[PDB]
C-alpha cells in the first residue's frame, strides 16, 4: 500500500504553485488529491515549497507534537501555505472548503530512514 511518506506528499505538497490563486483552490485540490473520497476531511493544509525544503524540517527544531509525542519538528523559517477548512454548506459528496493563503512556520512529525515527514501537525 501507499507509504506514510507518500501519503504526506499526496495530502500536503504543492510545489507546482507558489500560492493559492483564487477562492476555489481548496475545493479543487481537496477533490483532486482524493481527500474527499470516503468523507469530507474537515481541515487540511497544503505547503507551497520544494519537497527537499520540507523534508529538511526533520533536521530542524525538535518540539512536542500537539498530542505529546516528541518526534515533531518546527521550521526555522516561514513557508507559503494554504489552509483549507470545511464550510457551513459542505455536504458529502459535495464537500465545500474555505481557502486561506498565509505565511507561517510548519510543524510536522517525522519517521523512518531516511527520516522524513509523515504527518502535518500545525502551522504557527
Can you give a write-up of this model?
Its main location: secreted. Endonuclease that catalyzes the cleavage of RNA on the 3' side of pyrimidine nucleotides. Acts on single-stranded and double-stranded RNA. Belongs to the pancreatic ribonuclease family. It is a single chain. This protein is of the alpha+beta class. The protein has a single domain (1-124), classed as P-30 Protein, CATH 3.10.130.10. 18% of the residues lie in helices and 33% in strands. It has helices at residues 4-12, 25-32, 51-55, and strands spanning 43-47, 61-63, 72-74, 79-86, 97-104, 106-111, 116-123. The strands form two sheets. A four-stranded antiparallel β-sheet has the order 2-3-6-7. Strand 2 and strand 3 (72-74) form a beta hairpin. The radius of gyration is 14 Å and the shape is globular.
* N-end to C-end Cα span: 32 Å
Name given to the CATH architecture: Roll
CATH superfamily: Ribonuclease A-like domain
State the strand order across the main sheet. Answer: 2-3-6-7
The CATH first-level class comes to Alpha Beta
For the biggest sheet, the summary is: 4 strands, antiparallel
Count every helix, treating DSSP H or I runs of 4 or more residues as helices. 3
The helix fraction, in percent, is: 10-25%
Query: Radius of gyration, Cα only, in angstroms?
Result: 14 Å
User: How many structurally independent domains?
Assistant: 1
What name does the CATH topology carry? P-30 Protein
User: Which structural class matches the secondary elements?
Assistant: alpha+beta
Strand content: 25-35%
Order of helices and strands: HHEHEEEEEE
- The best one-word shape is globular
What's the β-strand tally? 7
Glycosylation sites: 1, 7, 34, 37, 41
EC number: 4.6.1.18
Function: Endonuclease that catalyzes the cleavage of RNA on the 3' side of pyrimidine nucleotides. Acts on single-stranded and double-stranded RNA.
Subcellular location: Secreted
Amino acid at each position: 500500500k501507499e507509504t506514510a511518506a507518500a501519503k504526506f506528499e499526496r495530502q500536503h505538497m504543492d510545489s507546482s504553485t507558489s500560492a493559492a490563486s483564487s477562492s476555489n483552490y481548496c475545493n479543487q485540490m481537496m477533490k483532486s488529491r482524493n481527500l474527499t473520497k470516503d468523507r469530507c476531511k474537515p481541515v487540511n493544509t497544503f505547503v507551497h515549497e520544494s519537497l527537499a525544503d520540507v523534508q529538511a524540517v526533520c533536521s530542524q527544531k525538535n518540539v512536542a507534537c500537539k498530542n505529546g509525542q516528541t518526534n515533531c519538528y518546527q521550521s526555522y523559517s516561514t513557508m507559503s501555505i494554504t489552509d483549507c477548512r470545511e464550510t457551513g454548506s459542505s455536504k458529502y459528496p459535495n464537500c465545500a472548503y474555505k481557502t486561506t493563503q498565509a505565511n507561517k512556520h510548519i510543524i510536522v512529525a517525522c519517521e523512518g530512514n531516511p527520516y522524513v515527514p509523515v504527518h502535518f501537525d500545525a502551522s504557527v
